[PDB]
Amino acid sequence: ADKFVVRLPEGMREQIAEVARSHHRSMNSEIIARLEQSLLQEGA
Amino acid sequence: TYSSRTADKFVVRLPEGMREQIAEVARSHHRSMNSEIIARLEQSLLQEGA
Amino acid sequence: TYSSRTADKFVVRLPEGMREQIAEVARSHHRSMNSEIIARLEQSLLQEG
Amino acid sequence: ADKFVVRLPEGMREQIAEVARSHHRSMNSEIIARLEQSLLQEGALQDN
DNA sequence: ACTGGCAAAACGCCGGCA
DNA sequence: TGCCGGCGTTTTGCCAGT
């Protein structure tokens, strides 16, 4: 599977981890889950 | 203090052809792939916060 | 070939305060002012057929 | 009036040129008129 | 007007960490 | 799974030279 290194702004770094644990999934699992939701919003 | 060389990098292991899917969106919205990802994350985050 | 350093350049004379207004919305959308301007112009044009 | 040089993609210049000619306006006038209505259009997204 | 191009930023990605 | 220095690149904002 291909990968993309994402330069992230100030806050996100930590804030992204916070939501991951509370969702009981890894960071990469969180980001991709959010990303697919966003892309699904476009299907409107 | 916080440039793009300083910023927090994070490898996102994309599912098959999802990368190509971001790309198409990124082009149409006239932003880099980085900015694309950021913009979507940022918005997804703020939805839960309001 | 047609890169960024090849692209047609047009000097836009902007009215009072439009600059900061555009820059603000540009950051707001995670985009360079250039891309920001192009994006809006583009959408304006196809809206007109 | 302050300046800002725009790099336009392939077909944009001629595209804008035509529309301007259509509206009997300067190219710069056309660009601004459009950038104007584009800004206050989404600036009118204060609760839709 | 135009447009080479500069200096600085951002980009994409590698290849190495832990 | 996560972290990141740093390379080689384009892009970006904005000039001066024509």
Structure tokens at D10: 């392939």
Residues in B 1-50 whose C-beta is less than 7 A from nucleic strand F are 5-6, 8-11
Q: What HEC string does D1-48 produce?
A: CEEEEEEECCCHHHHHHHHHHHCCCCHHHHHHHHHHHHHHHHCCCCCC
**What's the one-letter identity of residue D25?**
R
The half-sphere exposure of A24 on its side-chain side, counting CA atoms within 13 A, is 0
Structure tokens at D39: 């800004």
Contact D35, C36 (CB under 8 A): no
| B28-B34-B39 Cα angle (round to 5) | 70
Contact C44, D38 (CB under 8 A): yes
Interface residue D40 vs chain C (CB under 8 A): no
**What's the one-letter identity of residue D15?**
Q
Closest CA relative to residue D43, chosen from C25, B13, B44, A2:
C25
Contact C10, D13 (CB under 8 A): yes
**Rounded Cα–Cα distance for residues B19 and A14 (Å):** 24
What's the CATH number where C40 sits?
A: 1.10.1220.10
Number of domains, chain C: 1
**Rounded Cα–Cα distance for residues A14 and B16 (Å):** 27
| A10-A13-A15 Cα angle (round to 5) | 100
Q: Is the CB of D4 under 7 A from strand F?
A: yes
Domain residues for B26?
Answer: 1-50
Long-range contacts of C23-31 (CB under 8 A, 24+ apart): C25/D39, C25/D42, C29/B31, C29/B39, C30/B31, C30/B35, C30/B36, C30/B38, C30/B39, C30/B42, C31/B29, C31/B30, C31/B31, C31/B35
Query: Nearest nucleotide by C1' from A17 CA?
Result: F2
**Rounded Cα–Cα distance for residues A37 and A39 (Å):** 5
**Rounded Cα–Cα distance for residues C14 and B35 (Å):** 26
Q: Do chains A and D touch (3 or more CB pairs under 8 A)?
A: no
Closest CA relative to residue B14, chosen from A35, A2, A6, A8:
A2
Dihedral angle of Cα B32, C20, C17, D26, to the nearest 10 degrees = -20
Structure tokens at A31: 């980001």
Contact A38, B44 (CB under 8 A): yes
**What's the one-letter identity of residue A39?**
L
Q: What count of other Cβ atoms lies within 10 Å of the Cβ of residue A38? A: 20
A1 alpha carbon, distance to own chain's centre: 17
Contact B10, A6 (CB under 8 A): yes
Contacts of B26 in chain A (CB under 8 A): none
Q: Is the CB of B22 under 7 A from strand E?
A: no
Experimental method: X-ray
Interface residue B13 vs chain A (CB under 8 A): yes
A41 alpha carbon, distance to own chain's centre: 15
Contact C22, D2 (CB under 8 A): no
**Rounded Cα–Cα distance for residues A18 and A3 (Å):** 22
Q: D27 to chain C, minimum CA–CA distance in Å?
A: 9
